[PDB]
Structures are given as C-alpha cells and as structure tokens.
Amino acid sequence: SDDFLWFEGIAFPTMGFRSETLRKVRDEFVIRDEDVIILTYPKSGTNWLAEILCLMHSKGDAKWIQSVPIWERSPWVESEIGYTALSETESPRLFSSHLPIQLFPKSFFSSKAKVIYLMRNPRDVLVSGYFFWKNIKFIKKPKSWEEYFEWFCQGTVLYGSWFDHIHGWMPMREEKNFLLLSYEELKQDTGRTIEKICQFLGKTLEPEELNLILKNSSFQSMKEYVVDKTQLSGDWKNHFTVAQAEDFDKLFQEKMADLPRELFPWE
Ligand SMILES: C[C@]12CC[C@H](O)C[C@@H]1CC[C@@H]1[C@@H]2CC[C@]2(C)C(=O)CC[C@@H]12
C-alpha cells in the first residue's frame, strides 16, 4: 500500500500506468521526425499549450477541439491509453509527456522530431499540484500543505523533482528541434508566443485565422476518480508563508546555480 507506481527512481500515478509500458516507451517507442511533443513538468500549462497547437492545426475552428477531450488531442505517450493511441496513429502526431529526459524514448535522440518545452514558476506548479493531486482518488495524498511543500522541495512527488526535470532537459535548449517556452510569457502575451510556435513549427496563418486563434486561445477562453467535485485560487503568494518563500528562494538559488539565472523569467 504505497499508493504509486515506482519506476526508475520516479513515482507515477497508480491507475492508468504500467512499468512494462514505461519500459517500452524508453526502449521501443518509435518517434517520427514529423511528431510534435509537448514537454512539461506536471501542472505547468500543458492543456493551454495543447489548445494553442490544436487551434493552430484547425485554423482557429474550435469545433473538433471542443468535443474531443484533452487526453485525446495530445495523449500522454507514457500512459496506457496514450501509448496505445500513439502506436496506431498516422503521422503527423501531437502528444504530451511529463517524462524526465532519461526515461524519454531513445528513438527521439537520433530524430528531427520537434519538441516544445514549457516551464513555469515552480511556486505556481507546487500550488496547482497540491490542489489537483490532493483531489484525486487512490493516489497518495499529503496530510497537509506543509507536508506537500516538503515533498515537492525534496522531489518525492509524482514525476519526481522539478529541479531534476529542468536540469535534464535544459541542455537541449539550443537544438534546432527544441523550443523553450515559459508559462509566464504564454500568459503575458499569447500573441508573441503563438508567433514563436509558428516560426518554430514552420506554419503560416492568414490574418483571419490568427484572429480566430488568438480569440480561442486567450487566458479567459482557457478558463473552461475525483474526490470532491468542487475544486475541479489566487496565487502562490496566498499559500506560501514568508518563511516558506525565503526557504524556497534559497533552495532554488542553490539548485539552479549551474544554470543561467536569466533563463527563468519569474523572480
Ligand atoms: C494525470 C495526467 C498527467 C499529469 C497531468 O498534468 C494531469 C493529467 C490528467 C489526465 C491523465 C494524465 C495521465 C494519463 C491519463 C491517465 C490518460 O491516459 C487519460 C487521463 C490522463
């Protein structure tokens, strides 16, 4: 009764996943140079980014996108339902993945498949994870906020350390098939970000298609198994005590020292 799937030093949700699949993801899954993958540490804005991409493909028409659910528009390759769908989908394929770099498909590293990595202020990530995860059945829950705070800081949470996750993927930030984005810039100005994604993917849009896309992909438009139905707010400053914040800056400072500080927009 540990309440999670432990695999290669990383904890995964009990339901929906299996070791044998995780093993195949890294050893067998074949990636195509035409595939596009959304890479994120859980709760960093994957859905929003999935929306933008789906809208870009549908030229703004929020038709299909409306009916089709998240895990179907950009399924998670590491999940059962995910691995299966991707295994029988015809390129071009759009899929998501929270996997740290050392467990990602081997085939990827010799391909031209394009990857978009989205990162977010870890403070917001920790809060969203707290409220999201503590509201999901069968997965180990924290006895309290203070406790979850400690797990996140020590890496003992689903998908592992946020710090490790960023360190492992950052070394590719300059590859031509790797686009690095921040949730912060995504929110500050979707237009600018959409333009980067178009440039990175080599897509072009008619002024009127962009118009529609910009409208269906604004933060407001985004505002759209489970314990309590309710929670399905504020900011990290409404949860972190001043002491937790001072302790987190310190930890962040120590942990990210070997990486350019200006790589991270937030304070
Ligand atoms: C938990 C999560 C991956 C961690 C995410 O940021 C929160 C996501 C909720 C939907 C889950 C997904 C894992 C794979 C699942 C189980 C599927 O294949 C369909 C429902 C999917």
UniProtKB/Swiss-Prot annotation:
BP GO annotations: 3'-phosphoadenosine 5'-phosphosulfate metabolic process; bile acid catabolic process; cholesterol metabolic process; ethanol catabolic process; lipid catabolic process; steroid metabolic process; sulfation; thyroid hormone metabolic process
Enzyme class of the recorded protein, top EC level: transferase
Phosphoserine PTM positions: 233
Substitution effect: residue 146 to K: Decreases of the sulfotransferase activity toward DHEA; no effect on the sulfotransferase activity toward pregnenolone
Keyword tags: Bile acid catabolism, Cytoplasm, Lipid degradation, Lipid metabolism, Phosphoprotein, Steroid metabolism, Transferase
Residues that coordinate or bind 3'-phosphoadenylyl sulfate: 43-48, 120, 128, 183, 217, 222
Origin superkingdom: Eukaryota
Functional note: Sulfotransferase that utilizes 3'-phospho-5'-adenylyl sulfate (PAPS) as sulfonate donor to catalyze the sulfonation of steroids and bile acids in the liver and adrenal glands. Mediates the sulfation of a wide range of steroids and sterols, including pregnenolone, androsterone, DHEA, bile acids, cholesterol and as well many xenobiotics that contain alcohol and phenol functional groups. Sulfonation increases the water solubility of most compounds, and therefore their renal excretion, but it can also result in bioactivation to form active metabolites.
Name assigned to this protein: Sulfotransferase 2A1
Gene name of the record: SULT2A1
